[PDB]
Symmetry: D2
Subunit: 119 residues, 4 copies
């Protein structure tokens, strides 16, 4: 796993985000078990509760590009700092990466099971 | 607008969907104002309320591919029938296509204004 | 249907909203087919996409208080002005009130079918 | 904390759920810092992704009944088994209960911090 290259893809995705309501763009990138990278950016909506997280876009892009399992994940904010996914996004990642998905956090790389136990 | 080509793209996207809980795959495709096509497929979740509609993935892909405004939209189910987006997805499409967005339905081509007035 | 009394319940609900992120509180009230009134207020979340609309809370309160069908609906903002529900909330109302649910709008009372056709 | 009384309330709420699509009713109950109990049940939707978890309805009811902070939480399925909230609902509970919120699980009483670290 090339974590700097994954973080670079996440920062590039962050630059594409639609976040005019919060002013808080987010980008995410993940390695799929076939070796390819998929990315997402957040897309906010005037009805706040319809906003899509970057991880939502990433999971949609996972299947649009052929499916598979996530093996490594990173998320970054508009300053390029590492972000831990919100609880909803942890649940999406669990479905497609499982407990052993590696998650890039500001405190260090963590298995998803350490971030969402008993899921 | 080449509606048959857009429907073919939506059906292609539908074949990639992750809908093991309902068994109801959905694909969507839309023309962007710069002329390119974006697509989405639905992605269900063990927690049903976390499922992403095909139109969610389509809007995520819109910005992942550089943004823009949507001008024409088609959605299809697993047997190729035209589907009308749910209310949530109508609101997502309103944000990025507005009332003039053309929606391919079994009743014909309808502007989004007629499917979600006063949004 | 006593529309002023329903709007009064909606404004009271609006005063209870949790909307620190947008500063945009919303209250909703509805008449159930058994004669009782149910209400909701919006509840925002630090992850914007997890925010619950007032109509979401209203539909949860509909079942917590015994279920039934909605017959009249009104939604108000922090100035007490009438609001049309977003597309997601129109879809929730359709499930529990159907096309003939009466919806209070600033332009006048409308059946839900006029706000969410072909649902 | 009277955990049996809280579980009885969650089971009561579960019996009111609207889950005709999955056939999987869920109820939740929580103690508020002022001492009162709030409850929720899940409400599914024909568009699966619009379903509301029991914890969504519980948080809606928290503010509908005057707000506060959650201190203890229990969730049960249709046979009375204790359920751990999905990631989305963990995030909702974090907003209104924080890491010290006590969560009733089959592994015992766990603080939310241990179920959703670094939120
Ligand atoms: Zn998220
Ligand atoms: Zn939809
Ligand atoms: Zn809404
Ligand atoms: Zn949940």
């Amino acid at each position: 796993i090339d974590w700097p290259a994954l973080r670079t893809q996440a920062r590039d995705a962050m630059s594409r985000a639609y976040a005019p309501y919060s002013g808080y763009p987010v980008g995410a990138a993940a390695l799929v078990d076939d070796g390819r990278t998929v990315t997402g950016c957040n897309v906010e909506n005037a009805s706040y509760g319809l906003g899509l997280c970057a991880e939502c876009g990433l999971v949609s892009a996972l299947f649009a590009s052929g499916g598979g399992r996530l093996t490594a994940f990173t998320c970054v904010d508009g300053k390029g700092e590492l972000l831990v996914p919100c609880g909803r996004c942890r649940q999406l990642l669990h479905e497609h990466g499982g407990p052993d998905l590696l998650v890039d956090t500001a405190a260090g790389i963590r298995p998803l099971a350490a971030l969402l136990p008993d899921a």
